Write an enzyme that holds these catalytic residues in place. Structure first.
Site, PDB file in Angstrom:
ATOM      1  N   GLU B  64      40.468   2.700   1.394  1.00 47.17           N
ATOM      2  CA  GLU B  64      40.604   1.449   2.126  1.00 47.17           C
ATOM      3  C   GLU B  64      40.405   0.206   1.270  1.00 47.17           C
ATOM      4  OE1 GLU B  64      39.704   2.260   6.866  1.00 47.17           O
ATOM      5  OE2 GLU B  64      39.430   0.339   5.840  1.00 47.17           O
ATOM      6  N   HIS B 217      13.294  19.026  -5.436  1.00 49.19           N
ATOM      7  CA  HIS B 217      13.398  17.573  -5.493  1.00 49.19           C
ATOM      8  C   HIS B 217      12.142  16.976  -4.869  1.00 49.19           C
ATOM      9  CE1 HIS B 217      14.507  17.979  -1.270  1.00 49.19           C
ATOM     10  NE2 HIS B 217      15.439  18.836  -1.649  1.00 49.19           N
ATOM     11  N   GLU B 305       0.680 -19.412  -2.944  1.00 50.84           N
ATOM     12  CA  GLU B 305       0.172 -20.320  -1.927  1.00 50.84           C
ATOM     13  C   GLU B 305       0.205 -21.778  -2.356  1.00 50.84           C
ATOM     14  OE1 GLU B 305      -4.393 -19.270  -3.327  1.00 50.84           O
ATOM     15  OE2 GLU B 305      -3.612 -18.614  -1.382  1.00 50.84           O
ATOM     16  N   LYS B 444     -19.246  -4.501  -8.941  1.00 49.15           N
ATOM     17  CA  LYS B 444     -19.149  -3.212  -9.609  1.00 49.15           C
ATOM     18  C   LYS B 444     -18.376  -3.358 -10.910  1.00 49.15           C
ATOM     19  CE  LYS B 444     -14.854  -1.044  -8.120  1.00 49.15           C
ATOM     20  NZ  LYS B 444     -14.189   0.283  -8.051  1.00 49.15           N
TER      21      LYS B 444
HETATM   22  N1  ATP Z   1     -22.130   2.889 -19.277  1.00 49.74           N
HETATM   23  C1  ATP Z   1     -22.563   2.449 -18.090  1.00 49.74           C
HETATM   24  N2  ATP Z   1     -23.694   1.711 -18.053  1.00 49.74           N
HETATM   25  C2  ATP Z   1     -24.133   1.268 -16.872  1.00 49.74           C
HETATM   26  N3  ATP Z   1     -23.601   1.450 -15.662  1.00 49.74           N
HETATM   27  C3  ATP Z   1     -22.484   2.182 -15.728  1.00 49.74           C
HETATM   28  C4  ATP Z   1     -21.908   2.710 -16.873  1.00 49.74           C
HETATM   29  N4  ATP Z   1     -20.756   3.414 -16.560  1.00 49.74           N
HETATM   30  C5  ATP Z   1     -20.664   3.298 -15.258  1.00 49.74           C
HETATM   31  N5  ATP Z   1     -21.674   2.566 -14.690  1.00 49.74           N
HETATM   32  C6  ATP Z   1     -21.856   2.263 -13.275  1.00 49.74           C
HETATM   33  O1  ATP Z   1     -21.069   3.159 -12.521  1.00 49.74           O
HETATM   34  C7  ATP Z   1     -20.663   2.520 -11.289  1.00 49.74           C
HETATM   35  C8  ATP Z   1     -19.181   2.706 -11.085  1.00 49.74           C
HETATM   36  O2  ATP Z   1     -18.966   3.766 -10.131  1.00 49.74           O
HETATM   37  P1  ATP Z   1     -18.855   5.271 -10.591  1.00 49.74           P
HETATM   38  O3  ATP Z   1     -17.793   5.351 -11.685  1.00 49.74           O
HETATM   39  O4  ATP Z   1     -20.178   5.814 -10.959  1.00 49.74           O
HETATM   40  O5  ATP Z   1     -18.261   5.992  -9.314  1.00 49.74           O
HETATM   41  P2  ATP Z   1     -18.617   6.094  -7.766  1.00 49.74           P
HETATM   42  O6  ATP Z   1     -19.190   4.748  -7.342  1.00 49.74           O
HETATM   43  O7  ATP Z   1     -19.484   7.258  -7.465  1.00 49.74           O
HETATM   44  O8  ATP Z   1     -17.177   6.203  -7.123  1.00 49.74           O
HETATM   45  P3  ATP Z   1     -15.685   5.725  -7.402  1.00 49.74           P
HETATM   46  O9  ATP Z   1     -15.347   5.884  -8.844  1.00 49.74           O
HETATM   47  O10 ATP Z   1     -14.833   6.584  -6.474  1.00 49.74           O
HETATM   48  O11 ATP Z   1     -15.651   4.276  -6.922  1.00 49.74           O
HETATM   49  C9  ATP Z   1     -21.137   1.066 -11.371  1.00 49.74           C
HETATM   50  O12 ATP Z   1     -22.318   0.869 -10.603  1.00 49.74           O
HETATM   51  C10 ATP Z   1     -21.398   0.868 -12.867  1.00 49.74           C
HETATM   52  O13 ATP Z   1     -22.436  -0.076 -13.099  1.00 49.74           O
HETATM   53  N1  ATP Z   2     -12.663 -32.085  -9.067  1.00 49.77           N
HETATM   54  C1  ATP Z   2     -13.415 -31.318  -8.272  1.00 49.77           C
HETATM   55  N2  ATP Z   2     -14.712 -31.654  -8.093  1.00 49.77           N
HETATM   56  C2  ATP Z   2     -15.470 -30.894  -7.299  1.00 49.77           C
HETATM   57  N3  ATP Z   2     -15.130 -29.796  -6.621  1.00 49.77           N
HETATM   58  C3  ATP Z   2     -13.845 -29.486  -6.815  1.00 49.77           C
HETATM   59  C4  ATP Z   2     -12.935 -30.174  -7.604  1.00 49.77           C
HETATM   60  N4  ATP Z   2     -11.692 -29.564  -7.567  1.00 49.77           N
HETATM   61  C5  ATP Z   2     -11.874 -28.539  -6.771  1.00 49.77           C
HETATM   62  N5  ATP Z   2     -13.149 -28.431  -6.279  1.00 49.77           N
HETATM   63  C6  ATP Z   2     -13.664 -27.405  -5.380  1.00 49.77           C
HETATM   64  O1  ATP Z   2     -12.823 -26.275  -5.459  1.00 49.77           O
HETATM   65  C7  ATP Z   2     -12.835 -25.579  -4.191  1.00 49.77           C
HETATM   66  C8  ATP Z   2     -11.420 -25.304  -3.752  1.00 49.77           C
HETATM   67  O2  ATP Z   2     -11.110 -23.917  -3.996  1.00 49.77           O
HETATM   68  P1  ATP Z   2     -10.351 -23.470  -5.304  1.00 49.77           P
HETATM   69  O3  ATP Z   2      -9.140 -24.381  -5.483  1.00 49.77           O
HETATM   70  O4  ATP Z   2     -11.277 -23.412  -6.453  1.00 49.77           O
HETATM   71  O5  ATP Z   2      -9.799 -22.039  -4.917  1.00 49.77           O
HETATM   72  P2  ATP Z   2     -10.383 -20.701  -4.286  1.00 49.77           P
HETATM   73  O6  ATP Z   2     -11.406 -21.104  -3.231  1.00 49.77           O
HETATM   74  O7  ATP Z   2     -10.893 -19.772  -5.322  1.00 49.77           O
HETATM   75  O8  ATP Z   2      -9.121 -20.151  -3.512  1.00 49.77           O
HETATM   76  P3  ATP Z   2      -7.879 -20.693  -2.679  1.00 49.77           P
HETATM   77  O9  ATP Z   2      -7.119 -21.699  -3.472  1.00 49.77           O
HETATM   78  O10 ATP Z   2      -7.074 -19.443  -2.338  1.00 49.77           O
HETATM   79  O11 ATP Z   2      -8.494 -21.260  -1.400  1.00 49.77           O
HETATM   80  C9  ATP Z   2     -13.661 -26.436  -3.230  1.00 49.77           C
HETATM   81  O12 ATP Z   2     -14.975 -25.913  -3.076  1.00 49.77           O
HETATM   82  C10 ATP Z   2     -13.677 -27.808  -3.910  1.00 49.77           C
HETATM   83  O13 ATP Z   2     -14.866 -28.529  -3.615  1.00 49.77           O
HETATM   84  N1  ATP Z   3      13.550  26.538  -6.143  1.00 45.94           N
HETATM   85  C1  ATP Z   3      13.253  25.766  -5.091  1.00 45.94           C
HETATM   86  N2  ATP Z   3      12.032  25.189  -5.044  1.00 45.94           N
HETATM   87  C2  ATP Z   3      11.729  24.415  -3.998  1.00 45.94           C
HETATM   88  N3  ATP Z   3      12.481  24.108  -2.940  1.00 45.94           N
HETATM   89  C3  ATP Z   3      13.681  24.690  -3.012  1.00 45.94           C
HETATM   90  C4  ATP Z   3      14.141  25.516  -4.030  1.00 45.94           C
HETATM   91  N4  ATP Z   3      15.436  25.936  -3.769  1.00 45.94           N
HETATM   92  C5  ATP Z   3      15.723  25.369  -2.624  1.00 45.94           C
HETATM   93  N5  ATP Z   3      14.711  24.603  -2.110  1.00 45.94           N
HETATM   94  C6  ATP Z   3      14.725  23.847  -0.862  1.00 45.94           C
HETATM   95  O1  ATP Z   3      15.001  24.744   0.199  1.00 45.94           O
HETATM   96  C7  ATP Z   3      15.931  24.146   1.129  1.00 45.94           C
HETATM   97  C8  ATP Z   3      17.217  24.931   1.131  1.00 45.94           C
HETATM   98  O2  ATP Z   3      17.200  25.847   2.247  1.00 45.94           O
HETATM   99  P1  ATP Z   3      18.397  26.843   2.505  1.00 45.94           P
HETATM  100  O3  ATP Z   3      19.572  26.412   1.630  1.00 45.94           O
HETATM  101  O4  ATP Z   3      17.983  28.251   2.335  1.00 45.94           O
HETATM  102  O5  ATP Z   3      18.795  26.525   4.003  1.00 45.94           O
HETATM  103  P2  ATP Z   3      19.207  25.238   4.839  1.00 45.94           P
HETATM  104  O6  ATP Z   3      19.698  24.207   3.832  1.00 45.94           O
HETATM  105  O7  ATP Z   3      18.124  24.799   5.737  1.00 45.94           O
HETATM  106  O8  ATP Z   3      20.479  25.747   5.632  1.00 45.94           O
HETATM  107  P3  ATP Z   3      22.008  25.352   5.864  1.00 45.94           P
HETATM  108  O9  ATP Z   3      22.711  25.771   4.575  1.00 45.94           O
HETATM  109  O10 ATP Z   3      22.548  26.019   7.082  1.00 45.94           O
HETATM  110  O11 ATP Z   3      22.000  23.824   5.953  1.00 45.94           O
HETATM  111  C9  ATP Z   3      16.063  22.687   0.699  1.00 45.94           C
HETATM  112  O12 ATP Z   3      15.095  21.876   1.353  1.00 45.94           O
HETATM  113  C10 ATP Z   3      15.801  22.763  -0.804  1.00 45.94           C
HETATM  114  O13 ATP Z   3      15.291  21.536  -1.312  1.00 45.94           O
HETATM  115 MG    MG Z   4      -6.197 -19.893  -4.305  1.00 41.42          MG
END
Ligand code: ATP
Ligand code: ATP
Ligand code: ATP
Ligand code: MG
Ligand code: ATP
Ligand code: ATP
Ligand code: ATP
Ligand code: MG
Ligand code: MG
Ligand code: MG
Ligand code: MG
Ligand code: MG
Lengths: 484, 484, 484
Positions: B64, B217, B305, B444
């Site tokens: 087409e 896939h 913003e 953290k």
């Molecule tokens: N070398 C380091 N010295 C001091 N504090 C550390 C150090 N490495 C990691 N931390 C501490 O580890 C914390 C970061 O979280 P952490 O990696 O222990 O995992 P989690 O809090 O148990 O979970 P997730 O990783 O899922 O958030 C922080 O409180 C950071 O201060």
């Molecule tokens: N010349 C200035 N003297 C004193 N305070 C200022 C001056 N310019 C900006 N501020 C202070 O900066 C703050 C405005 O927020 P800022 O532009 O730092 O962004 P943010 O709070 O981190 O985030 P967002 O822009 O998304 O609101 C206010 O507390 C305002 O009093």
């Molecule tokens: N080696 C493989 N590993 C993982 N998934 C696979 C593999 N080979 C095929 N598949 C998946 O299995 C499905 C193919 O199914 P099959 O061809 O047996 O029947 P069907 O497509 O449901 O039937 P019909 O041909 O009537 O449409 C697909 O979703 C394909 O991605």
């Molecule tokens: Mg801002």
């Protein structure tokens, strides 16, 4: 990265930014919508704006409306089409059926309809062909998968002639298939969809460009409004403003608030006043507006909860006398309701008032009062549009947002629009000795020191009289001071 | 566990990882979608990338669209097809119908179409056959359960010839049946579905491989974007990075914050700054970016913003002078809006800017400002993609996430992206003596001691002046200290 | 209460527990599904597992796929069918139509198809007949209520011959009618439905037995996975484990935690670590895994938010040196993402790793990180499967679940999986003098005294140094202690 296809401007405001320059040259364009959405008006505006601006003649093919009714309908918009017909710049072709005739042939009239268009192009030297209500000949006595060949030969012939074409097709639904038969999308290289979707007993017009073969555009739905000057598509872009004002500041209206803000808000910013009801927000709006009488500047007021007489009575109870600024042409009051019109038309009304009056300060009372029925995304769009249009014309705007939870809460704005504003003033209730006093607080600033403190204020017979501080209490914003 | 079928690479970025190597060799592939989703572009890119890279000729069958319109559309993407036609590497076969002809036979032309394709394969030594808009001949005048035999004989003789085939079929819906008749899925051994689903007045393109007979896939839907270089599929895999940096750290920008973090963030990490609005997050972003001028390093800033001037004025009010770094080619500001484009395109824009500028530090201001309209899963995907692209190229990134509940709350991030970042800095408001002061806290770290304390700071005319501590108070996070 | 019908085993792993022994002997079975769900693979696996195990020959009926393509597809799974065809154990009968033929009769070939099957059964002594894609002959040129007689005569004749039959039918929807015409359910005595339902841009395969006439089964939908060895159905049954360990306990890794738990966790249990982010959960996981190097035991680690190199850097910052255990074949790291594959496949991956490595301790980092996109029931199923499979092989497992509300909250697990685990360790943040200290607590035990106390700890350069207690405070868990 290389050269792109050429495209010509429809001169409709907003549409030339969505499609990155206008409709492509040579191809066709499908404009499909429900009844009463603006398909015909798009075609007539596309012809008229091209005739007036670039002196490009165009033809208009009709199938169910007589030409004089079209001219009568277009006369109410302001533009005259009969004068342009007499000047030989526009030709409304008439293919509407005679009520008394014959039906011996189903739809084999396209081979003559092509010639009827083609000779008219060759006598008027037209450039913009615009077939309207095309879904009345090729589908009059035809079923599905048959209109594909007719639409293909029509679009191919209008591409062979080499003129811009705009078509019109009808719908049955709002979110279902794009056309009546679900097959006209795969023929036309350009598809534009108009919608008139209804939610919450309110209508809302949107425009969407579905596909432009060979070029780029904006993806999604963009609202528009059918005003007295035609379709007015509202775009989304604010790269025009490259100016700021670290220089001289405008006064707030209250000398204490200017001292607490550092010497004035700014020349251009977005001031947000918040708090609970009955706290004194309308007083702040009135003091912001009335200050324009001192420097002989023009400022207007939008009211969405009060009504004129009541505003004048409350102003005279404070010593304001708005009739003097009304008579001096330094004040205008709109005094509308949020449910009188939809939220989308409010932006157009505000834009029209700003353009006509050419003011310096805008004060929209109770921005949350027109944020009840609508959802969050529509209100965010409205706030962003108002703030951008006020910022791009160096206008100091002050808004107002009342909160639902009246005593000590969090989340200063329930609609999450505090991040767009520049200054935020925090009004609240402070229960002191069981008498329910009120206090002011400059929450945040975007360029000055702004006096980080909490000041008790009252409302006297003249204006806001701000007292010293709450220095011997604790947890002020939670509505529960405990003195220490 | 044993040998698998052979498959050849389409050389489309992203697609070769989804299908574990490319399309299978010898079989066919069905690419079905709605109008305006990228079915034709997939075929043209699949032909062009195979011609350029491996010097494999291919044919293109049309039904087409005339060949010159296809060449004109493909010219806007950058690649030239007419030169390759003149070189004998590509042949667009033309089967589009003449607008003036005969319709005595519905669709009994496949027995000649096979010979017409096969004669071109034997004269051009083609390898990639690509039939486009095939659902216009076998279904032009045929009903259901009849096109099954036509598609079966098509796939059978194209497999007897033994070349890779890509087919194109249309849809009516987005989540309903896969094809127009619901029968073409059981014929083609490979089914790829393109969608253009619309939600919240925003479009979003996705790709899905439904079935690959004989191989494996990825199951599900994967987003893509039609950019200026064609389809650019974003994959999901982060096994490339095998490097880490326990060695020398980059400076934050504030010497007090470097002392509080132990001597610098790291060479590569994900810094998250959080808090309420008006707390000082943009100041931290500005100090993070401006530090690159000290070591002659390149860093760019993403704003969602603000807009340029608003940023330059605030920077000059702090003593930053971004115009010098802009002139010295050590700074670039994007200054976009979250609602200008969808969330899917922002990742591509950030990737393109990072690739073109080749910076060392990225600062995305207000990561939560573009997380309003979208759902949680899309925002999590965007955050994961941005963090992966920053981590795999040894780039120190700093983000910004404002909270809704402004005073004492919990759940530091409302979008629950706290488990992706590496450092978290806690900014908050502290009501002290009714003056509403602010405080900092390194929540953290992921490899240092990070100074577990809460530090009050202010914002002076130069920068953040961090004070000592809150040692004579209680419950600082809850926004209501009680001194003891 | 009395003797039941006989049924023979398909030897598909998982399926023989759902249907209480396998398919019934003599009857037929309808396997209906959407395109690309595994209908053909079920038939081929049902033939292969019966040929290999019990030396039962079987035939395969084809209607739209040639036999060599089926052999080519099955060769990728590991099993070769060409050798079994040469051995006379398997016979793929070919009924696929010639692309060049005649269509003078619609579908009156079943009376010859019966004899073609029956002669093959009498020539190969087959037991498992498997008709595939049967919905291409009786419905090729027939309407509704006509295929009922054809399916009735087919099932009646295969019952008269007396062999197990498996049929294959296609669908159009996912939750609508079971077959294409809604009439094939009332003919076949056994109905099995395969689904490929899509939710949240993620696919999920399920199996369901709708009806077994004369016997009992499991009602509902059961997930499965098409792996490299075929369909691998996950069942639900844990009557195998009849053992417990009140005897010798394995060490936790921290001697203070072993003293606080009474001398070791247990030989087999489910340890859960919870708390907020940045609290020290990964340190507990690392100490749990590294302890296996002391006793020359094998333990593996699952990571869902880290990146291998980051884990090694954080371990070396604690003094762990995972490279020595990696070189000594006492450690394995998976380093995957939760959104790389669905939650359905993660259980299969964990089972494969546990079976291949044969370890003694499993530590799944961030069990809540792969519980975001999915619903509550799917995550509960995943947790139950992981815990049951770890418990049935006497493996000490440790998990990790971060909470959203970081400060003083309740409901220790937001997914309510706290009732499955055996031990729960409570990590939290404790604001002491405005420095945000951390503390440990053994919340519950299942067989020892476990030291009901709250212990503050820190993170040094070596490991967790647990301090004494919080004995002079009040409301420790609520995140705001008040000393008395
Ligand atoms: N070398 C380091 N010295 C001091 N504090 C550390 C150090 N490495 C990691 N931390 C501490 O580890 C914390 C970061 O979280 P952490 O990696 O222990 O995992 P989690 O809090 O148990 O979970 P997730 O990783 O899922 O958030 C922080 O409180 C950071 O201060
Ligand atoms: N010349 C200035 N003297 C004193 N305070 C200022 C001056 N310019 C900006 N501020 C202070 O900066 C703050 C405005 O927020 P800022 O532009 O730092 O962004 P943010 O709070 O981190 O985030 P967002 O822009 O998304 O609101 C206010 O507390 C305002 O009093
Ligand atoms: N080696 C493989 N590993 C993982 N998934 C696979 C593999 N080979 C095929 N598949 C998946 O299995 C499905 C193919 O199914 P099959 O061809 O047996 O029947 P069907 O497509 O449901 O039937 P019909 O041909 O009537 O449409 C697909 O979703 C394909 O991605
Ligand atoms: Mg801002
Ligand atoms: N002067 C006007 N001011 C505001 N709205 C107007 C004015 N004139 C017409 N309209 C509105 O414009 C729409 C009329 O659109 P138009 O007649 O161009 O096409 P349509 O009704 O969508 O098409 P069709 O004739 O196929 O039904 C109506 O919604 C009508 O209320
Ligand atoms: N003449 C007056 N004398 C004393 N108090 C007055 C007088 N006029 C108004 N007020 C006070 O003004 C308040 C009424 O609210 P106001 O009109 O200032 O608007 P607002 O609270 O800022 O917002 P909105 O009008 O949206 O509710 C009351 O507290 C009332 O006591
Ligand atoms: N230079 C470009 N930059 C960005 N997007 C482009 C560009 N050129 C085309 N597009 C987009 O690509 C899509 C066009 O896809 P294509 O014409 O290849 O197939 P299709 O429209 O989906 O198929 P069919 O012709 O069957 O309707 C449209 O969404 C169009 O906006
Ligand atoms: Mg009309
Ligand atoms: Mg008011
Ligand atoms: Mg196309
Ligand atoms: Mg099959
Ligand atoms: Mg961790």
């Amino acid at each position: 990265e290389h050269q792109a296809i050429a495209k010509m401007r429809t001169m409709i405001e907003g549409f030339d930014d969505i499609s990155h320059g206008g409709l492509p040259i040579g191809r066709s364009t499908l404009v499909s919508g429900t009844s009463g959405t603006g398909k015909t008006l798009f075609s007539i505006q596309f012809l008229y704006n091209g005739i007036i601006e670039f002196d490009e003649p165009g033809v208009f093919v009709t199938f169910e409306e007589t030409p004089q009714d079209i001219i009568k309908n277009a006369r109410s918009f302001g533009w005259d089409l009969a004068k342009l017909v007499d000047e030989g710049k526009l030709f409304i072709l008439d293919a509407s059926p005679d009520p008394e005739g014959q039906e011996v042939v189903g739809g084999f009239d396209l081979s003559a309809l092509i010639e009827r268009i083609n000779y008219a192009i060759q006598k008027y030297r037209a450039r913009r062909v615009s077939i309207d209500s095309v879904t009345s000949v090729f589908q009059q006595y035809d079923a599905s998968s048959v209109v594909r060949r007719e639409l293909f030969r029509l679009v191919a012939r209008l591409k062979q002639i080499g003129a811009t074409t705009v078509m019109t097709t009808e719908r049955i639904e709002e979110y279902g298939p794009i056309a009546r038969y679900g097959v006209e999308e795969f023929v036309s290289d350009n598809v534009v969809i108009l919608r008139n979707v209804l939610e919450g007993e309110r209508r809302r017009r949107t425009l969407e460009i579905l596909k432009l073969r060979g070029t780029s555009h904006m993806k999604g739905e963009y609202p528009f409004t059918i005003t007295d000057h035609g379709i007015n598509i509202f775009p989304l872009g604010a790269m025009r403003l490259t100016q700021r004002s670290s220089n001289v500041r405008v006064s707030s209206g209250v000398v204490r608030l200017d001292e607490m803000c550092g010497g004035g808000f700014f020349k251009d910013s977005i001031i947000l006043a918040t708090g609970a009801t009955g706290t004194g927000k309308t007083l702040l709006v009135s003091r912001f507006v009335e200050n324009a009488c001192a420097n002989k500047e023009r400022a207007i007021l939008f009211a969405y909860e009060e009504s004129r007489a009541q505003l004048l009575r409350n102003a005279y109870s404070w010593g304001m006398d708005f009739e003097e600024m009304e008579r001096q042409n330094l004040l205008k009051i709109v005094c509308a309701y949020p449910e009188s019109a939809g939220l989308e038309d409010h932006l157009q009304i505000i834009k029209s008032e700003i353009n006509d009056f050419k003011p310096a300060r805008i004060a929209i009372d109770s921005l949350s009062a027109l944020a009840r029925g609508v959802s969050n995304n529509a209100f965010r769009q409205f706030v962003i549009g108002v703030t951008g249009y006020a910022k791009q014309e160096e206008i100091t705007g002050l808004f107002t947002n009342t909160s639902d939870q009246f005593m000590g809460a969090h989340s200063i704005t329930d609609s999450h629009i505090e991040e767009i504003t520049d200054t935020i003033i925090l009004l609240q209730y402070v229960e002191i000795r069981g008498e329910m006093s009120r206090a002011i607080n400059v929450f945040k600033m975007r360029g000055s020191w702004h006096d980080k403190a909490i000041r008790e204020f009252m409302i006297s017979d003249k204006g806001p009289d701000i007292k010293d501080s709450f220095r011997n209490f604790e947890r002020i914003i939670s509505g529960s001071p405990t003195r220490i």
